């Protein structure tokens, strides 16, 4: 339909243009000049090709469409107007910037308006990382590009676990090699029985001999692909090492692999080229020499949102922190009435100036005073804000400053918030605060590393060994007494032989001293490297020193492999928020990983893009996103489609949220169908990769299968036909639930932890079957969750006494499948009871638990991963139905040997979790500033130490868990 | 002096209530509690110095207590009093933490009103978030109006310019073209720019009103919060009696 576009000719006369809502830009331009031919002063106008369009978007920014074939709806222009001017920029540059801006969600020009020098230095200097990654991508093309786009999905363990080794017959796996090399697709099948240790080239050669229906002896001209998805075997690894082959071995499934030609894949992959963007072009005294105390002038607060009558007086809390350690006591200003927040006071601190560590962070807060409730006046922060006392170039901050104050985080009653972000609130309607810092007649900066080396060497048995070994094995959250700290500091030169002691010895040092920290720096310089599961802790709130995190990052560089990196990626993305500057070593590590492995890049992008809606890290993650999109290669277009699809979905649910809140199920369904039938919706929602898994493509939607649930949430079911020709081998339909209104980062954390529990149980020698199904959060209360096939809730199974579930399992597994079904049910139940107890998940009714037809059992929804209640708390008590299924329907469920082996597996699982509890502690401690209500305030993380009984010995924990189980079911 | 009656001894394995009690308290405040390692005989001591809760372990051997071997004190109370009189050298011990129907009804009422204030605080927080989102979208719309006004402004400037000159009198080609179409075209142009500037102005006024509402919501939330913390503390300290 016509929208009466107002066109702005170079002369200036407005043109009333009528065009269809779906119209190409060039057609509108041609029609505009055709109409201007009727308009006066047409002779002044130049040729059509020379000019170009300009419009203002709803994002309050202007864009000049250099080469746009998009529709009017795709232009998303704020007002129906179209300026015509002579273009001046570059076509490729502007189109790339538009693409990056649509991927991030905010225009790239806003990052240019930001005049903060650290932002510009970051943007100019991270391009070295981008370019080096791109150059690495092109070292051995098209092989290197093939590795980039399709990376090997391999385990880090080449040596097979003994249980799945026994699952294989003599270590021989039978694989169905499908070859479609023919004038028409006919699906030639060759059955192979080969050892699991054979490299892909041996599979290729032996399958070639099989296809020769004799033994011919092609050579270097063939590769393998997983049937039903875009997974490929290009790297010389044991065939078992790939996750598809291990999954087939463990689940007893038949592995199907297509044999394909290298040239088809090589043609499928376009070239990746990176070009420098436009922004690629644009007295000091040592801190130790200054002899004075820290002293900062609090000038005034512009305004605070506190009642004059309700609240009598306000003051400002301050501090000098280093991580979470106050380097000295807090100072206050004298209380003033709320009307006139003027202090103008030189607050002074016990900390000596050279005694300042490189990571000091002078936290603030505007706080209230109220004596009506009691003599001890209650103090609550009206607002807060942090300042790094050093600049990105090592210089101590001087002069005046103005800080906007963030609101207090919900549920945080501590006056200061030294966990929060170190910068001003971008909003300028917030309360501000003027400060001013000491001037030393010169710019003063932290000493270089060589001076710290020079300071040392001048500033500085069996029972000891046993105590050191006992300390090293202790929990990271284990309380350390001062005697232990003095012992740790005394024998540091012997603590270096025990490299597991670095996270402990670090908390032994007083960062106040200038003498101790030089010695600690030398120690970290010569510290032997440690395992990446322990060097990850050194990247958290409590270890903010540059040398500490440099050591941790170089250890991950030497030892972290891409299998685990994809697993601990959420934690590292969240630990980015704990870094002090913009351009650090962790961000370069993560970027160089995401720019050499599209598996890492896809989820890196989606995690950051999810965390773009928080204003505290929106700027950091936006700069990171724009750098990635500069050098992400050809995947960006795909990402856009995903984003486009997601946007449409969110929009639909938005119309469901308010317009369709009060209408019934049938009318909401018919309106949903009407919204689906729109051709733009079909174009956006089909033909793109998946956010949950890049390897699985989504195809044409199935409008009949897509439907809106009748549950209270009302999410959406979306079904996609698989584009791959081998749709039957893997799965016909990809089904996903889109939820708009539920936080799904807690669910991601729970499912991840379930995955590591399953991995350690399998590695030990225990086969407890878990379902860590895919989950993704891409925004605020926006998420995608996978669908599990042939699964029904306990309520659904029971509806369709105590024997109903076992009767259903018998009907679905009558025959020889009975015993294997019962065994899988027992092992799945053991694993999930252990996991839900240890993590203390919420109340699990029937709807929370589902059972497949195979026999597996699993839990679907989460949200209390540390018992968000006040504070033990066995949520999942074994229902009598569960016991009946465990012991094969015997009435005396407790008095069976099946129940004895069930309990023994539970005990072994509990111990298995307890030896690795350090990993769970670290992974939970990396999620403190995430904003999840459940995982702030270490009082929450101490739940995972209460349910794992870390202070006691394994025998006390054994007795505690036995008592917990005995109470739970209580005979059913 | 016997233990189990001293002020500093609190008892069980709470472990974190010590952090709450010692936080935001004067330097030298201390606590002694037996937990976190073994059933009895641990007796750790939390001393607040430099804003930090230092932990000191009380070793027990041969019926004697003491911070480090050799142990010269008899009971916990003797050690506590001896280090209250004399410094640890690093600060001597300064500040020790210390009908049925009526108290039961008071506790029940406090729980009920705590629930009331918690729900009120949640409603205030959700209103705060909604108003913040409205403020951000209104600021974006104001910036969009600013850009549109600017672009229409140089469009209008270019129009008048060319028009005024190219078409001035009968001597030019425009004998009556100006009156015929072009003055009306410029009239529509100025009407459009006036409409857009009026929309920008009224939306700035709406944004100012929304900002005032935001300020009021923040004031109400910030006044109601500390009362909520005080009521939570009172409810906790009556529940600690549980008798």
PDB file of N, CA, C and O in Angstrom, chain B residues 43-89:
ATOM      1  N   UNK B  43      37.104 -23.983  67.825  1.00  0.00           N
ATOM      2  CA  UNK B  43      37.090 -22.662  68.455  1.00  0.00           C
ATOM      3  C   UNK B  43      37.872 -21.635  67.631  1.00  0.00           C
ATOM      4  O   UNK B  43      38.928 -21.153  68.028  1.00  0.00           O
ATOM      5  N   UNK B  44      37.342 -21.326  66.454  1.00  0.00           N
ATOM      6  CA  UNK B  44      37.926 -20.255  65.662  1.00  0.00           C
ATOM      7  C   UNK B  44      37.478 -18.899  66.199  1.00  0.00           C
ATOM      8  O   UNK B  44      36.446 -18.776  66.871  1.00  0.00           O
ATOM      9  N   UNK B  45      38.279 -17.875  65.909  1.00  0.00           N
ATOM     10  CA  UNK B  45      38.023 -16.513  66.355  1.00  0.00           C
ATOM     11  C   UNK B  45      38.061 -15.581  65.154  1.00  0.00           C
ATOM     12  O   UNK B  45      39.044 -15.565  64.406  1.00  0.00           O
ATOM     13  N   UNK B  46      36.992 -14.810  64.976  1.00  0.00           N
ATOM     14  CA  UNK B  46      36.908 -13.790  63.939  1.00  0.00           C
ATOM     15  C   UNK B  46      37.138 -12.429  64.580  1.00  0.00           C
ATOM     16  O   UNK B  46      36.355 -12.002  65.436  1.00  0.00           O
ATOM     17  N   UNK B  47      38.206 -11.753  64.164  1.00  0.00           N
ATOM     18  CA  UNK B  47      38.554 -10.432  64.670  1.00  0.00           C
ATOM     19  C   UNK B  47      38.521  -9.438  63.522  1.00  0.00           C
ATOM     20  O   UNK B  47      39.174  -9.652  62.498  1.00  0.00           O
ATOM     21  N   UNK B  48      37.776  -8.350  63.686  1.00  0.00           N
ATOM     22  CA  UNK B  48      37.671  -7.341  62.638  1.00  0.00           C
ATOM     23  C   UNK B  48      38.838  -6.370  62.763  1.00  0.00           C
ATOM     24  O   UNK B  48      38.939  -5.634  63.747  1.00  0.00           O
ATOM     25  N   UNK B  49      39.721  -6.377  61.768  1.00  0.00           N
ATOM     26  CA  UNK B  49      40.832  -5.439  61.704  1.00  0.00           C
ATOM     27  C   UNK B  49      41.031  -5.024  60.256  1.00  0.00           C
ATOM     28  O   UNK B  49      40.963  -5.865  59.353  1.00  0.00           O
ATOM     29  N   UNK B  50      41.265  -3.730  60.035  1.00  0.00           N
ATOM     30  CA  UNK B  50      41.430  -3.214  58.688  1.00  0.00           C
ATOM     31  C   UNK B  50      40.223  -3.410  57.800  1.00  0.00           C
ATOM     32  O   UNK B  50      40.368  -3.491  56.578  1.00  0.00           O
ATOM     33  N   UNK B  51      39.030  -3.496  58.387  1.00  0.00           N
ATOM     34  CA  UNK B  51      37.827  -3.797  57.647  1.00  0.00           C
ATOM     35  C   UNK B  51      37.650  -5.255  57.283  1.00  0.00           C
ATOM     36  O   UNK B  51      36.627  -5.605  56.680  1.00  0.00           O
ATOM     37  N   UNK B  52      38.599  -6.118  57.640  1.00  0.00           N
ATOM     38  CA  UNK B  52      38.586  -7.522  57.257  1.00  0.00           C
ATOM     39  C   UNK B  52      38.408  -8.400  58.486  1.00  0.00           C
ATOM     40  O   UNK B  52      38.922  -8.088  59.564  1.00  0.00           O
ATOM     41  N   UNK B  53      37.684  -9.506  58.317  1.00  0.00           N
ATOM     42  CA  UNK B  53      37.490 -10.489  59.383  1.00  0.00           C
ATOM     43  C   UNK B  53      38.663 -11.460  59.364  1.00  0.00           C
ATOM     44  O   UNK B  53      38.646 -12.474  58.667  1.00  0.00           O
ATOM     45  N   UNK B  54      39.704 -11.141  60.130  1.00  0.00           N
ATOM     46  CA  UNK B  54      40.807 -12.072  60.312  1.00  0.00           C
ATOM     47  C   UNK B  54      40.326 -13.306  61.063  1.00  0.00           C
ATOM     48  O   UNK B  54      39.507 -13.213  61.982  1.00  0.00           O
ATOM     49  N   UNK B  55      40.848 -14.465  60.668  1.00  0.00           N
ATOM     50  CA  UNK B  55      40.523 -15.743  61.288  1.00  0.00           C
ATOM     51  C   UNK B  55      41.736 -16.247  62.052  1.00  0.00           C
ATOM     52  O   UNK B  55      42.840 -16.301  61.501  1.00  0.00           O
ATOM     53  N   UNK B  56      41.532 -16.614  63.315  1.00  0.00           N
ATOM     54  CA  UNK B  56      42.597 -17.137  64.161  1.00  0.00           C
ATOM     55  C   UNK B  56      42.121 -18.442  64.782  1.00  0.00           C
ATOM     56  O   UNK B  56      41.050 -18.488  65.397  1.00  0.00           O
ATOM     57  N   UNK B  57      42.914 -19.495  64.623  1.00  0.00           N
ATOM     58  CA  UNK B  57      42.556 -20.809  65.138  1.00  0.00           C
ATOM     59  C   UNK B  57      43.103 -20.988  66.548  1.00  0.00           C
ATOM     60  O   UNK B  57      44.253 -20.637  66.830  1.00  0.00           O
ATOM     61  N   UNK B  58      42.271 -21.528  67.433  1.00  0.00           N
ATOM     62  CA  UNK B  58      42.645 -21.783  68.819  1.00  0.00           C
ATOM     63  C   UNK B  58      42.997 -23.263  68.927  1.00  0.00           C
ATOM     64  O   UNK B  58      42.116 -24.124  68.991  1.00  0.00           O
ATOM     65  N   UNK B  59      44.293 -23.560  68.945  1.00  0.00           N
ATOM     66  CA  UNK B  59      44.750 -24.930  69.127  1.00  0.00           C
ATOM     67  C   UNK B  59      44.444 -25.416  70.539  1.00  0.00           C
ATOM     68  O   UNK B  59      44.535 -24.659  71.511  1.00  0.00           O
ATOM     69  N   UNK B  60      44.075 -26.691  70.643  1.00  0.00           N
ATOM     70  CA  UNK B  60      43.751 -27.333  71.909  1.00  0.00           C
ATOM     71  C   UNK B  60      44.607 -28.581  72.074  1.00  0.00           C
ATOM     72  O   UNK B  60      44.635 -29.439  71.187  1.00  0.00           O
ATOM     73  N   UNK B  61      45.290 -28.682  73.213  1.00  0.00           N
ATOM     74  CA  UNK B  61      46.154 -29.823  73.499  1.00  0.00           C
ATOM     75  C   UNK B  61      46.266 -30.011  75.003  1.00  0.00           C
ATOM     76  O   UNK B  61      46.539 -29.050  75.729  1.00  0.00           O
ATOM     77  N   UNK B  62      46.067 -31.251  75.457  1.00  0.00           N
ATOM     78  CA  UNK B  62      46.231 -31.625  76.864  1.00  0.00           C
ATOM     79  C   UNK B  62      45.383 -30.748  77.783  1.00  0.00           C
ATOM     80  O   UNK B  62      45.826 -30.332  78.855  1.00  0.00           O
ATOM     81  N   UNK B  63      44.153 -30.467  77.362  1.00  0.00           N
ATOM     82  CA  UNK B  63      43.271 -29.639  78.161  1.00  0.00           C
ATOM     83  C   UNK B  63      43.664 -28.182  78.228  1.00  0.00           C
ATOM     84  O   UNK B  63      43.207 -27.468  79.123  1.00  0.00           O
ATOM     85  N   UNK B  64      44.501 -27.720  77.303  1.00  0.00           N
ATOM     86  CA  UNK B  64      44.964 -26.343  77.262  1.00  0.00           C
ATOM     87  C   UNK B  64      44.619 -25.726  75.914  1.00  0.00           C
ATOM     88  O   UNK B  64      44.644 -26.400  74.881  1.00  0.00           O
ATOM     89  N   UNK B  65      44.305 -24.434  75.932  1.00  0.00           N
ATOM     90  CA  UNK B  65      43.958 -23.689  74.732  1.00  0.00           C
ATOM     91  C   UNK B  65      45.028 -22.643  74.455  1.00  0.00           C
ATOM     92  O   UNK B  65      45.662 -22.122  75.378  1.00  0.00           O
ATOM     93  N   UNK B  66      45.227 -22.338  73.174  1.00  0.00           N
ATOM     94  CA  UNK B  66      46.153 -21.284  72.805  1.00  0.00           C
ATOM     95  C   UNK B  66      46.290 -21.080  71.311  1.00  0.00           C
ATOM     96  O   UNK B  66      46.120 -22.023  70.537  1.00  0.00           O
ATOM     97  N   UNK B  67      46.612 -19.852  70.893  1.00  0.00           N
ATOM     98  CA  UNK B  67      46.684 -19.543  69.467  1.00  0.00           C
ATOM     99  C   UNK B  67      47.783 -20.344  68.779  1.00  0.00           C
ATOM    100  O   UNK B  67      47.596 -20.853  67.669  1.00  0.00           O
ATOM    101  N   UNK B  68      48.941 -20.465  69.423  1.00  0.00           N
ATOM    102  CA  UNK B  68      50.056 -21.209  68.860  1.00  0.00           C
ATOM    103  C   UNK B  68      50.750 -22.003  69.956  1.00  0.00           C
ATOM    104  O   UNK B  68      50.711 -21.635  71.132  1.00  0.00           O
ATOM    105  N   UNK B  69      51.379 -23.101  69.552  1.00  0.00           N
ATOM    106  CA  UNK B  69      52.154 -23.907  70.482  1.00  0.00           C
ATOM    107  C   UNK B  69      53.390 -23.132  70.937  1.00  0.00           C
ATOM    108  O   UNK B  69      54.037 -22.465  70.124  1.00  0.00           O
ATOM    109  N   UNK B  70      53.750 -23.196  72.231  1.00  0.00           N
ATOM    110  CA  UNK B  70      53.081 -23.929  73.313  1.00  0.00           C
ATOM    111  C   UNK B  70      51.827 -23.234  73.834  1.00  0.00           C
ATOM    112  O   UNK B  70      51.724 -22.009  73.770  1.00  0.00           O
ATOM    113  N   UNK B  71      50.892 -24.020  74.360  1.00  0.00           N
ATOM    114  CA  UNK B  71      49.617 -23.515  74.849  1.00  0.00           C
ATOM    115  C   UNK B  71      49.723 -23.303  76.354  1.00  0.00           C
ATOM    116  O   UNK B  71      50.006 -24.248  77.098  1.00  0.00           O
ATOM    117  N   UNK B  72      49.494 -22.068  76.800  1.00  0.00           N
ATOM    118  CA  UNK B  72      49.689 -21.711  78.199  1.00  0.00           C
ATOM    119  C   UNK B  72      48.401 -21.353  78.925  1.00  0.00           C
ATOM    120  O   UNK B  72      48.443 -21.083  80.130  1.00  0.00           O
ATOM    121  N   UNK B  73      47.268 -21.338  78.232  1.00  0.00           N
ATOM    122  CA  UNK B  73      46.013 -20.935  78.843  1.00  0.00           C
ATOM    123  C   UNK B  73      45.150 -22.154  79.148  1.00  0.00           C
ATOM    124  O   UNK B  73      45.284 -23.210  78.524  1.00  0.00           O
ATOM    125  N   UNK B  74      44.258 -21.998  80.124  1.00  0.00           N
ATOM    126  CA  UNK B  74      43.454 -23.118  80.597  1.00  0.00           C
ATOM    127  C   UNK B  74      42.145 -23.258  79.830  1.00  0.00           C
ATOM    128  O   UNK B  74      41.868 -24.319  79.265  1.00  0.00           O
ATOM    129  N   UNK B  75      41.329 -22.208  79.807  1.00  0.00           N
ATOM    130  CA  UNK B  75      40.030 -22.241  79.152  1.00  0.00           C
ATOM    131  C   UNK B  75      39.986 -21.189  78.053  1.00  0.00           C
ATOM    132  O   UNK B  75      40.915 -20.396  77.881  1.00  0.00           O
ATOM    133  N   UNK B  76      38.888 -21.199  77.294  1.00  0.00           N
ATOM    134  CA  UNK B  76      38.687 -20.184  76.264  1.00  0.00           C
ATOM    135  C   UNK B  76      38.547 -18.807  76.897  1.00  0.00           C
ATOM    136  O   UNK B  76      39.088 -17.816  76.392  1.00  0.00           O
ATOM    137  N   UNK B  77      37.824 -18.725  78.017  1.00  0.00           N
ATOM    138  CA  UNK B  77      37.567 -17.437  78.653  1.00  0.00           C
ATOM    139  C   UNK B  77      38.867 -16.796  79.118  1.00  0.00           C
ATOM    140  O   UNK B  77      39.046 -15.577  79.015  1.00  0.00           O
ATOM    141  N   UNK B  78      39.793 -17.601  79.644  1.00  0.00           N
ATOM    142  CA  UNK B  78      41.076 -17.059  80.079  1.00  0.00           C
ATOM    143  C   UNK B  78      41.841 -16.454  78.909  1.00  0.00           C
ATOM    144  O   UNK B  78      42.391 -15.353  79.017  1.00  0.00           O
ATOM    145  N   UNK B  79      41.884 -17.163  77.779  1.00  0.00           N
ATOM    146  CA  UNK B  79      42.563 -16.643  76.596  1.00  0.00           C
ATOM    147  C   UNK B  79      41.910 -15.356  76.107  1.00  0.00           C
ATOM    148  O   UNK B  79      42.600 -14.374  75.789  1.00  0.00           O
ATOM    149  N   UNK B  80      40.577 -15.339  76.058  1.00  0.00           N
ATOM    150  CA  UNK B  80      39.860 -14.167  75.567  1.00  0.00           C
ATOM    151  C   UNK B  80      40.136 -12.966  76.461  1.00  0.00           C
ATOM    152  O   UNK B  80      40.422 -11.869  75.977  1.00  0.00           O
ATOM    153  N   UNK B  81      40.069 -13.158  77.780  1.00  0.00           N
ATOM    154  CA  UNK B  81      40.309 -12.044  78.694  1.00  0.00           C
ATOM    155  C   UNK B  81      41.762 -11.584  78.646  1.00  0.00           C
ATOM    156  O   UNK B  81      42.038 -10.377  78.687  1.00  0.00           O
ATOM    157  N   UNK B  82      42.703 -12.526  78.548  1.00  0.00           N
ATOM    158  CA  UNK B  82      44.112 -12.157  78.498  1.00  0.00           C
ATOM    159  C   UNK B  82      44.417 -11.321  77.268  1.00  0.00           C
ATOM    160  O   UNK B  82      45.194 -10.362  77.339  1.00  0.00           O
ATOM    161  N   UNK B  83      43.826 -11.669  76.126  1.00  0.00           N
ATOM    162  CA  UNK B  83      44.053 -10.867  74.933  1.00  0.00           C
ATOM    163  C   UNK B  83      43.096  -9.688  74.815  1.00  0.00           C
ATOM    164  O   UNK B  83      43.266  -8.861  73.914  1.00  0.00           O
ATOM    165  N   UNK B  84      42.095  -9.592  75.692  1.00  0.00           N
ATOM    166  CA  UNK B  84      41.358  -8.343  75.836  1.00  0.00           C
ATOM    167  C   UNK B  84      42.183  -7.319  76.602  1.00  0.00           C
ATOM    168  O   UNK B  84      42.138  -6.121  76.299  1.00  0.00           O
ATOM    169  N   UNK B  85      42.938  -7.772  77.604  1.00  0.00           N
ATOM    170  CA  UNK B  85      43.782  -6.851  78.359  1.00  0.00           C
ATOM    171  C   UNK B  85      45.014  -6.436  77.561  1.00  0.00           C
ATOM    172  O   UNK B  85      45.407  -5.265  77.585  1.00  0.00           O
ATOM    173  N   UNK B  86      45.634  -7.373  76.848  1.00  0.00           N
ATOM    174  CA  UNK B  86      46.880  -7.120  76.140  1.00  0.00           C
ATOM    175  C   UNK B  86      46.696  -7.334  74.643  1.00  0.00           C
ATOM    176  O   UNK B  86      45.913  -8.183  74.210  1.00  0.00           O
ATOM    177  N   UNK B  87      47.434  -6.555  73.855  1.00  0.00           N
ATOM    178  CA  UNK B  87      47.299  -6.582  72.406  1.00  0.00           C
ATOM    179  C   UNK B  87      47.841  -7.885  71.825  1.00  0.00           C
ATOM    180  O   UNK B  87      48.661  -8.579  72.431  1.00  0.00           O
ATOM    181  N   UNK B  88      47.369  -8.210  70.618  1.00  0.00           N
ATOM    182  CA  UNK B  88      47.795  -9.433  69.949  1.00  0.00           C
ATOM    183  C   UNK B  88      49.224  -9.349  69.431  1.00  0.00           C
ATOM    184  O   UNK B  88      49.774 -10.371  69.008  1.00  0.00           O
ATOM    185  N   UNK B  89      49.831  -8.167  69.445  1.00  0.00           N
ATOM    186  CA  UNK B  89      51.203  -8.011  68.977  1.00  0.00           C
ATOM    187  C   UNK B  89      52.182  -8.708  69.916  1.00  0.00           C
ATOM    188  O   UNK B  89      51.817  -9.115  71.020  1.00  0.00           O
TER     189      UNK B  89
END
